[PDB]
Amino acid sequence: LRRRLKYFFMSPCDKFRAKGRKPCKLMLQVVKILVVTVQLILFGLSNQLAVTFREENTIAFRHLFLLGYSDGADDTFAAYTREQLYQAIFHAVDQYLALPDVSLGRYAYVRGGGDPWTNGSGLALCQRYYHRGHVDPANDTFDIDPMVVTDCIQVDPPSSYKNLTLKFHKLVNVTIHFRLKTINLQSLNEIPDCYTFSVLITFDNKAHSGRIPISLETQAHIQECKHPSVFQSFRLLFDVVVILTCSLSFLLCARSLLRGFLLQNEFVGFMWRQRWERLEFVNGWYILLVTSDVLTISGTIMKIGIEAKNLASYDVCSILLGTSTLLVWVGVIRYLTFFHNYNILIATLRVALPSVMRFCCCVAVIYLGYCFCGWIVLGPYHVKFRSLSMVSECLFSLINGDDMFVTFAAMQAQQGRSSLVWLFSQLYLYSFISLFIYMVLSLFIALITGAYDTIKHP
Amino acid sequence: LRRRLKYFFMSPCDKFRAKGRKPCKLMLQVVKILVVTVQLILFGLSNQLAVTFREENTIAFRHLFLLGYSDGADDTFAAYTREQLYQAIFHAVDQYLALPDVSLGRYAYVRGGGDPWTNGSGLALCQRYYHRGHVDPANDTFDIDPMVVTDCIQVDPPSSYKNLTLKFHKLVNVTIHFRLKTINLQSLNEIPDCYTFSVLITFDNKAHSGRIPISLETQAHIQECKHPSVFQSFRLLFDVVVILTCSLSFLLCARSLLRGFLLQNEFVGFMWRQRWERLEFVNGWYILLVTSDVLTISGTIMKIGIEAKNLASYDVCSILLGTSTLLVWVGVIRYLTFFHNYNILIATLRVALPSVMRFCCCVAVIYLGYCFCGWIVLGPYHVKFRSLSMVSECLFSLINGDDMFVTFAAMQAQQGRSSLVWLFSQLYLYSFISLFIYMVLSLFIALITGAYDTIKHP
Amino acid sequence: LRRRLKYFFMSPCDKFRAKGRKPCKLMLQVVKILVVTVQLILFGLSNQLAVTFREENTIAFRHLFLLGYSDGADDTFAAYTREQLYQAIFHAVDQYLALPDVSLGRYAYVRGGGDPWTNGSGLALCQRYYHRGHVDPANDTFDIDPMVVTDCIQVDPPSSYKNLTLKFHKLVNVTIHFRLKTINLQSLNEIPDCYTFSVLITFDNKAHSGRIPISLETQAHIQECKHPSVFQSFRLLFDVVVILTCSLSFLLCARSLLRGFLLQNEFVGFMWRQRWERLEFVNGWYILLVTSDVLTISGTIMKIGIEAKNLASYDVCSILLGTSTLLVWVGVIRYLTFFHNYNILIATLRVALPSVMRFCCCVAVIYLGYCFCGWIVLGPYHVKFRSLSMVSECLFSLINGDDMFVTFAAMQAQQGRSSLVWLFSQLYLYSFISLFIYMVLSLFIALITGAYDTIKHP
Amino acid sequence: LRRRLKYFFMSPCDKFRAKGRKPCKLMLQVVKILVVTVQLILFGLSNQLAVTFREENTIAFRHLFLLGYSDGADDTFAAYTREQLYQAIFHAVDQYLALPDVSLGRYAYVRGGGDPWTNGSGLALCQRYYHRGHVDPANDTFDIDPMVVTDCIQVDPPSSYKNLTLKFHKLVNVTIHFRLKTINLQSLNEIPDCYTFSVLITFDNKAHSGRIPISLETQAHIQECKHPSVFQSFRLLFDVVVILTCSLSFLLCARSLLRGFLLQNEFVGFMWRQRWERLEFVNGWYILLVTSDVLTISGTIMKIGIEAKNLASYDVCSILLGTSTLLVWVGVIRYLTFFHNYNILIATLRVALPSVMRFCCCVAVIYLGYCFCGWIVLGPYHVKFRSLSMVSECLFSLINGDDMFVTFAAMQAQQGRSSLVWLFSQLYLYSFISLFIYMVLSLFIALITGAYDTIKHP
Numbered sequence A, B, C, D: 001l002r003r004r005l006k007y008f009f010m011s012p013c014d015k016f017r018a019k020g021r022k023p024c025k026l027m028l029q030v031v032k033i034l035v036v037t038v039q040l041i042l043f044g045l046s047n048q049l050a051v052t053f054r055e056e057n058t059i060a061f062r063h064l065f066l067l068g069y070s071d072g073a074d075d076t077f078a079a080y081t082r083e084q085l086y087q088a089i090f091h092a093v094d095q096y097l098a099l100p101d102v103s104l105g106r107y108a109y110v111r112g113g114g115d116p117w118t119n120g121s122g123l124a125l126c127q128r129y130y131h132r133g134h135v136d137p138a139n140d141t142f143d144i145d146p147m148v149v150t151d152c153i154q155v156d157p158p159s160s161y162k163n164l165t166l167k168f169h170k171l172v173n174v175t176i177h178f179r180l181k182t183i184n185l186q187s188l189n190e191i192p193d194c195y196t197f198s199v200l201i202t203f204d205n206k207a208h209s210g211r212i213p214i215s216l217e218t219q220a221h222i223q224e225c226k227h228p229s230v231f232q233s234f235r236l237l238f239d240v241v242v243i244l245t246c247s248l249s250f251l252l253c254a255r256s257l258l259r260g261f262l263l264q265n266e267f268v269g270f271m272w273r274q275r276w277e278r279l280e281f282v283n284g285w286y287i288l289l290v291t292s293d294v295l296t297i298s299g300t301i302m303k304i305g306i307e308a309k310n311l312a313s314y315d316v317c318s319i320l321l322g323t324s325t326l327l328v329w330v331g332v333i334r335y336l337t338f339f340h341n342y343n344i345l346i347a348t349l350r351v352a353l354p355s356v357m358r359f360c361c362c363v364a365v366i367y368l369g370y371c372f373c374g375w376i377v378l379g380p381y382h383v384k385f386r387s388l389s390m391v392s393e394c395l396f397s398l399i400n401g402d403d404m405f406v407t408f409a410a411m412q413a414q415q416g417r418s419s420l421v422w423l424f425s426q427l428y429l430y431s432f433i434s435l436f437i438y439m440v441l442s443l444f445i446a447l448i449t450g451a452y453d454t455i456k457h458p
């Protein structure tokens, strides 16, 4: 029992000396790292092209359909007069009708097939307003039924829409919906696939502020083209190989975990006979490996489905595959732990981690207090403090010494509007930054240094 | 006396074991944190909408009334010729007269009601110049009576103002004042309130430099609309709940403080009989809690007043509520002090703090010297060094390693204009940054590390 | 001798106890700090207005005289065709002739008074080209006499200049020179002074590259107006007070230094009788104070001269006064050295300084090597690496973690043009940053920590 | 043998005392540093002018030939309609034909001389499309022969090209090729050399996305002009001097290395008679010096060739000379090692280096995992995460606290598009930055501090 236990805790070289078994798990893990990384690289290279295609088409659509659009204007693009809004709407519809003659791309029209389109219509120009909308600011009176009514004109591909009359006082928004079909030629070494872009142009008046932002958005539905012919299954084979490798690694790691648990039970029983501590038998690296195996297998199944155009959940698949790749590359640290000079460093980090996490809790409460205060006080005056997540991002960047002067300068242009708020912002920023840079970061350094001293001088 | 004293200093668990009293203050403080944070979140969410409404309306006004205005041009927007100035003024007035036909918002005119408007006038176009303004640079002569005369034209809502004749040589400024009434519809789940925007357009010639900056500013007066009807008091109840919670906490903390003071007096008297040290009986956490309670109660009273449209002091109320929320979240640290592993870190910070503050004084004198020198020498040549507060912000950012290269690059464009100043700027910046990064920050680290060693090895 | 020596080294409180002399030097130094700081603040506030006036006038000139100018275009403003250049020149001259009718400022013309103007001329339009300039790139031939000929047209204030014929193939540059007189009215609480702006517009063809940059520059000559009359000497009195205070402090510090030297001589002689070490008698704080006094007196004399319009050397005066203010505020540290808890920190810095400077030399050689390498290799491809001073600024900013991603991104757009250079840039940047952040800054921290330990545990 | 060995390891001063030989190598190394640095400075100053000339000419070409071009638009400059593309092409060709009349530079046409030009043609306007290109997105069908056909029109210098008909549906790209000859006059104190700019304007449709980017690129071929005549060999002599100095240093260092090896062999043999450790006889500084000598000699030979216009490999020559200069300036550290106080610091760095490199490996695996995960997950949504090298640059900048807030803000505008991806980005960024700033950098500091303590307290 003592000998078996001592064998259970030997290093790979010691195990090889003791029993001579060729280490299959280590070579399997190396092969796993290689194949998982290659799969991720190929997947990312393939996804990059599709992302570029979608983005380029969307930029072209913005230039084609948004009157007076220029690059970099997305956030501020808006209308401010009734004639501006009418001109933008009519320009978008006219450009839709002129597309085959003017566009550098090759687009096919799509008709019908559900709402908001009718059977024969390619473009839907829809206006949404309030059911009852009496508003008289002169007498400070209003009578509103907030129920939204939609009235929408249908345009067939090549002027009734030219008679649009907007209900400005009760207008909620205006939308233009249409679909364009194109073939992704640049895929050529894949076979070109068929894209359907659904384009939505929104003129948004929900704020009722006299400023109506204009935006264009696209959703791309990708399918296989019916009759592809390019003059003159390794990906699937590689996915199968990855799945098989991860399954074998999973089985071996599960067997190791089960044997460890059995030895733990035997040891506990023997000690009870003779007479947190049990987790010593749990190999955390194997738990990490099993988790990465499961993530990789799920992600590869989803990747197979996506590459066949049967699925479109890119986000979840990418998150699974990326997290698993991160996990395997982290697990590479296990190998370095077997050599004394590297183990010194890894053990220092391990012994430091608990106190680092506790201090992280201590820091978290103070940080949250500062976040709330800054959001309530500075949010009305500072673009970086509008929302709580933005406030947290700004404060975290300040801790790391990024974007500090611009944060101060934004407040600089309020010293006359509100002296009290400017003074408060000075105190708030200086105190936060000084406390975190002089004291908190220094304490993290001290914790790591103390851990290192403990490791070096037991 | 020894028993009572030792009880006074026990931890909550020890006190519970000793006397069995259910801890009311701890649960009360947890509930207080919850309710104060929720109140702050609701208040901030409500204020965000009003801020957005005001800002969007002001952006729309800039686009409507400022001839040739574009986003991002606020700081440089100016006129440089007499025809430019006349065109800007006349465009603003014409747009005011055309507003009902062109604007995407719904605005009502406001007439009369005090200065600068006369009884029936909606817009005031006022020109301010010097009483006597003879200026003859050809002979280097001038005869100025600096008393400002105001001549102002009155315009009724739907062209005498077209006959404006500006006294350019003695002109101080030109202003356009008018008020617009609108209803904030997007409040819909509140009831829409009625806004009166007072719009001031300023053409500023106080520098007499040939460049006249143009700006537009708004003040919003919010009130309840007279006849609001939306087809089909929890906030006030929550405010009352917060006030009650804070009052109960205040009473309990005050009782604890008074009992501590009484025990302190008894101990001092007994020691005097037998025979800075007194503050040991003062519970600082309770002083913090009492301060937080007072701030929260004041801020909640102000918040109740504001939400009824009876008050408009958003800045003070927000500062009070935010500071109190920061204080309660900081006071959460007291709970962590009860567990040994967290108390190690908190005690390290506490023991470090005095020396950190002393070194802050030492740093302050040197920092102030650098601020003064940089302001006097570089201010004529560097945008970041124009005022003392700006100089301090720039230097503090440099200490934290932000905005360093742009600070150097601004000086790069003067190596030919003044070699001496460029060389001085090199020495100044390099010496300041090197001194603060190699030595000062390192000493803060050393202070924290020494405190940690003292705590870990008593 | 022992008693006198021990008295010479006592602290101010010990000296006061020993002999009872009221400390005049300390109160004098406090008063000096106050008066010098107030003088600097008043000087800077006064110089800010003049700087703003000059800059605003120059911006107005750019908008008035440079065809198609817009804010932020200074660095890229250039002509690229012959008609563009002709139009820019003629627009500048026409605007000069139209100035009284169109400008928002009030400017008087200046005629004659030296070169390049003739007696009756207000504007000089001068063209500089090569004496002999045959250039024939078709046959790869050229015959050039590089001697510069200047031909310049004279324009009187209100079209011979319209017949300008530029020698494009041998053109060196074109310049427009003219002077405008204005009165600085915004000085009103001073008396307005008279400004003469000399305006130089340069069309620069020295690169002969097909691109001719266009710039406008001004020199302002300020004088007192002949007949100033504003309807209804404390600065000079304050300057005299500052000079007197600094002179008294200088005399007292010099007396202290002389007495210290005398005691040093007596001690050395007595030791020689009985039987770097001498500098222990030198009070470094008094050397600093004497330097500050001298700088302040010189700067105040220059300030008096400048404020009377008898001098125009603002740079030297500002450098003197700012450096002296920095020195006095640094000298404030002497007072903190008298209290033990502050002396701990100051002594830590003092004991650390020698090793910090030695490591600075070690760092300097490696830093200079990297600067040379980066300048030679990356300068052809990277805007931040064009000159050696720019390279040093970029590397120093990288050490402090500023502007790092943009430095990488500029190189990103060369991975195709030159793979070798891009790879070298990767190695260069990563190695430099890693070496300086992991090792150098850490060693500075270690030096400070070791000094602190030595001070705390003698 | 003991005496000779002890002499081999003495310092220069000890060797001078022991044998009196005047140290030739040290003075030679000082002279080498001086001459190598001067050579590098002169070379860089000369290269700067050529770089500026090429860049200015290219900017002029962009302004002359690209319709509607403005500075800073290089990355987004593109066409979006067929008429836009036709206008850009025709404008470029028309400007080429009008160049002598409109350009501010002096350019000669180049005719024929290889492809794509025919014998008498100066400009080649070439269109590249697919051999067979049927694309019908309406029926989701396509028939493509991806073989590229080039059809190109030839234009002689002063309209057949006006009849260009683009095959938009199968268009791959359009290119305009032409060469211009100019003389670099600003070289005047060199002799002007003759430049041939080959200009390529690309209209790129490889993405087939409806957006066609437009770019202009130049290659400069520099030669000596046939008949240079400027009215009224030190560089080569200096290059020869540098080569001779480096050769002498190489010979002396090689002799020292050989003698060290001989002594090592003798010691090993004697010890074997009596009875990693051998490298103690290897002087690493001499290996560094020999490497720098070789690099300098190669770079100087290439520099001589380049300055004669016989070579054009600026990149390799610059890399060689810059690396050698960096190496000699690093080797300056050897001299500081001879003085005890500097040797303390250098020895601290030397003893720290092995553990620093080991921890660098440990950090590398985790860093690579994060790089892969970020590339796969965020690349579709974040501009900074498009490629792996860009991801690494972004993460490395984040470690150093640069460009943090903008990285967060780019993700901020996806909280609605994909909540899962935004949450993942929050976790990813916060965890990465916290781990590297609290723990990794702290451990580097601890390693350096421990090394320093070991050096200071043996």
Ligand SMILES: CCCCCCCC(=O)OC[C@H](COP(=O)(O)O[C@@H]1[C@H](O)[C@H](OP(=O)(O)O)[C@@H](O)[C@H](OP(=O)(O)O)[C@H]1O)OC(=O)CCCCCCC
Residues within 6 Å of the ligand: A008, A015, A019, A021, A022, A023, A024, A025, A026, A251, A252, A255, A256, A257, A259
């Ligand atoms: C539940 C069934 C799981 C699958 C069958 C498992 C059969 C199986 O492990 O045999 C031993 C070898 C090596 O397997 P491998 O896991 O590389 O080797 C084991 C580990 O080294 C383990 O230590 P840790 O890694 O630290 O836990 C050690 O205790 C075991 O010795 P012990 O038995 O004396 O305790 C080894 O046998 O395994 C293969 O070579 C698998 C590939 C070929 C067969 C593939 C069949 C699909």
Ligand SMILES: CCCCCCCC(=O)OC[C@H](COP(=O)(O)O[C@@H]1[C@H](O)[C@H](OP(=O)(O)O)[C@@H](O)[C@H](OP(=O)(O)O)[C@H]1O)OC(=O)CCCCCCC
Residues within 6 Å of the ligand: B008, B015, B019, B021, B022, B023, B024, B025, B026, B251, B252, B255, B256, B257, B259
């Ligand atoms: C001035 C009047 C103040 C209000 C009345 C005070 C009556 C009152 O405290 O009773 C004890 C409990 C618990 O009150 P609470 O403050 O939670 O409990 C006390 C604290 O634990 C205190 O320690 P520290 O917290 O460290 O100072 C301890 O010394 C006291 O024991 P001791 O007396 O033996 O010294 C406790 O009684 O209090 C409630 O349960 C209030 C809510 C219900 C009643 C609300 C009435 C409005």
Ligand SMILES: CCCCCCCC(=O)OC[C@H](COP(=O)(O)O[C@@H]1[C@H](O)[C@H](OP(=O)(O)O)[C@@H](O)[C@H](OP(=O)(O)O)[C@H]1O)OC(=O)CCCCCCC
Residues within 6 Å of the ligand: D008, D015, D019, D021, D022, D023, D024, D025, D026, D251, D252, D255, D256, D257, D259
């Ligand atoms: C393979 C042939 C190489 C060239 C001839 C080499 C002849 C040669 O070194 O003579 C000694 C002096 C000084 O040469 P230099 O290298 O400055 O001096 C030697 C080094 O100090 C060496 O120590 P390290 O530097 O630590 O290795 C030391 O061991 C030798 O003493 P030892 O002999 O007792 O062991 C010295 O002679 O050298 C010149 O003064 C060269 C310039 C004048 C001659 C130029 C002729 C082209």
Ligand SMILES: COc1ccc2c(c1)CC[C@@H]1[C@@H]2CC[C@]2(C)[C@@H](O)CC[C@@H]12
Residues within 6 Å of the ligand: A430, A434, B360, B361, B363, B364, B365, B367, B368, B371, B388, B389, B392, B396
């Ligand atoms: C305009 O004059 C100033 C403006 C700011 C500051 C000072 C003087 C002097 C003390 C400074 C403070 C900014 C914040 C600090 C640098 C703290 O981090 C430590 C000392 C502080």
Ligand SMILES: COc1ccc2c(c1)CC[C@@H]1[C@@H]2CC[C@]2(C)[C@@H](O)CC[C@@H]12
Residues within 6 Å of the ligand: B430, B434, C360, C361, C363, C364, C365, C367, C368, C371, C388, C389, C392, C396
């Ligand atoms: C253009 O060449 C330069 C330009 C600057 C510097 C050097 C060489 C060499 C010494 C450097 C200095 C910049 C500032 C430092 C990095 C200090 O922080 C420590 C050593 C200094």
Ligand SMILES: CCCCCCCC
Residues within 6 Å of the ligand: A282, A283, A284, A285, A288, A330
């Ligand atoms: C079993 C030792 C600890 C390993 C846990 C996994 C680290 C990521």
Ligand SMILES: CCCCCCCC
Residues within 6 Å of the ligand: B282, B283, B284, B285, B288, B330
């Ligand atoms: C009484 C112990 C110290 C607590 C003071 C409050 C800390 C914010």
Ligand SMILES: CCCCCCCC
Residues within 6 Å of the ligand: C282, C283, C284, C285, C288, C330
């Ligand atoms: C005489 C003690 C040292 C003081 C020198 C001046 C410090 C700036």
Ligand SMILES: CCCCCCCC
Residues within 6 Å of the ligand: D282, D283, D284, D285, D288, D330
């Ligand atoms: C032989 C001592 C070490 C020197 C190696 C070179 C350092 C760059």
